[PDB]
């Protein structure tokens, strides 16, 4: 296969993978998707529906006329607009479903807690680099200093954890934790400078020593943070909330499903556009993608007065 057609067909396959990933946003929205306000979602849906409508014209025109570079560009643009659209729709659907008097908003966990696997991995990596013969001076230094930036950011998380937990026993572990990590992390930073100034076996032994109190401090924290009452609590959306969000949610799903059929079918037409059955299939998908977006827009506008 010639590389231009391969490239065009790869654009479509990358687009279909992207739609599959983004569709998950619609499965159970029980947390905000992003930080848009309701009108921000509506504004984004409006903007994406113009970008999409143009890209859809470009997908059919360029597959018909054989312009493969522009076809693959229009498929990429369509994809980014559909992903945009879905992020805005899923966020709007969440905002609607939680706003019902019988629903309770989602609560985000106090810490990450991926931030803690990542810190502990940095430490293990720095220990291996400090210990094992296979690293340059510069490289032992980077692996030590990357530990400092994880643990330093763990201090900001403690702070925000305490200065928002209500629960005081936790608030105090998080204030205390911040100090232990800050004190251990300052200690490590000190050893790293002494090392990047005189690169001896004993200064290397000092940085190594400095990681144990630090790692213990990240372990008292990393372990204690992911207790219960600290994991995010999903929204509890009432039957009425669910029914109110449903037209947004189903129209966005139906949009994505028919967009996938439009792209899959375009992927074949770009190689051979003399195919009336596939143009008819594409047109069917295209009409559904357009009807879906109209419904979604209508549904978002019907509810928008509540968000003023």
Swiss-Prot record:
Residues 8-102 are annotated as: Helical bundle R7A. It comes from the Eukaryota. Changing residue 290 to E: Does not significantly affect the interaction with KANK1. Residues 8-308 are annotated as: Interaction with VCL and F-actin. The modification N6-acetyllysine is found at residue 193. Transmembrane segments: none annotated. Residues 230-302 are annotated as: Helical bundle R7B. Residues 110-229 are annotated as: Helical bundle R8. It is found in: Cell projection, Ruffle membrane; Cytoplasm, Cytoskeleton; Cell surface; Cell junction, Focal adhesion. Part of a complex composed of THSD1, PTK2/FAK1, TLN1 and VCL. Interacts with THSD1; this promotes interaction with PTK2/FAK1 and VCL. Interacts with NRAP and LAYN. Interacts with SYNM. Interacts with ITGB1; the interaction is prevented by competitive binding of ITGB1BP1. Binds with high affinity to VCL and with low affinity to integrins. Interacts with APBB1IP; this inhibits VCL binding. Interacts with PTK2/FAK1. Interacts with PIP5K1C. Interacts with F-actin. Interacts with SVEP1. Consists of an N-terminal FERM domain linked via a short unstructured region to a large flexible C-terminal rod which contains 13 amphipathic helical bundles (R1-R13). The rod begins with a five-helix bundle (R1) followed by three four-helix bundles (R2-R4). These are followed by a series of eight five-helix bundles (R5-R7 and R9-R13) in which the N- and C-termini are positioned at opposite ends of the bundle, creating a linear chain. The four-helix bundle R8 does not disrupt the chain because it is inserted into a loop in the R7 five-helix bundle. High molecular weight cytoskeletal protein concentrated at regions of cell-matrix and cell-cell contacts. Involved in connections of major cytoskeletal structures to the plasma membrane. With KANK1 co-organize the assembly of cortical microtubule stabilizing complexes (CMSCs) positioned to control microtubule-actin crosstalk at focal adhesions (FAs) rims. This is Talin-1. The lineage of its organism: Eukaryota, Metazoa, Chordata, Craniata, Vertebrata. The gene is Tln1.
């Amino acid at each position: 296969i010639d590389p231009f057609t391969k490239h065009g067909q790869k654009e479509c396959d990358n687009a279909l993978r992207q739609l599959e990933t983004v569709r998950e946003l619609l499965e159970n929205p029980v947390q905000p998707i992003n930080d848009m306000s309701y009108f921000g979602c509506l504004d984004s849906v409006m903007e994406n529906s113009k970008v999409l409508g143009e890209a859809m014209t470009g997908i059919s025109q360029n597959a018909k006329n054989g312009n493969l570079p522009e076809f693959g560009d229009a498929i990429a643009t369509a994809s980014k607009a559909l992903c945009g659209f879905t992020e805005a729709a899923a966020q709007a659907a969440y905002l609607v479903g939680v706003s019902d008097p019988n629903s309770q908003a989602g609560q985000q966990g106090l810490v990450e807690p991926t931030q803690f696997a990542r810190a502990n991995q940095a430490i293990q990596m720095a220990c291996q680099s400090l210990g094992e013969p296979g690293c340059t001076q510069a490289q032992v230094l980077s692996a030590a200093t990357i530990v400092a930036k994880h643990t330093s950011a763990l201090c900001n998380s403690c702070r925000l954890a305490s200065a928002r937990t209500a629960n005081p026993t936790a608030k105090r572990q998080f204030v205390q934790s911040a100090k232990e990590v800050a004190n251990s992390t300052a200690n490590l930073v000190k050893t790293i400078k002494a090392l990047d100034g005189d690169f001896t076996e004993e200064n290397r032994a000092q940085c190594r020593a400095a990681t144990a109190p630090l790692l213990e401090a990240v372990d008292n924290l990393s372990a204690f943070a992911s207790n219960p009452e600290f994991s995010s609590v999903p929204a509890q959306i009432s039957p009425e909330g669910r029914a109110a969000m449903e037209p947004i949610v189903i129209s966005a799903k139906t949009m994505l499903e028919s967009a996938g059929g439009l792209i899959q079918t375009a992927r074949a037409l770009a190689v051979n556009p003399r195919d009336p059955p596939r143009w008819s299939v594409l047109a069917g998908h295209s009409r559904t993608v357009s009807d879906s977006i109209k419904k979604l827009i209508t549904s978002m506008r019907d509810k928008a007065p509540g968000q003023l």
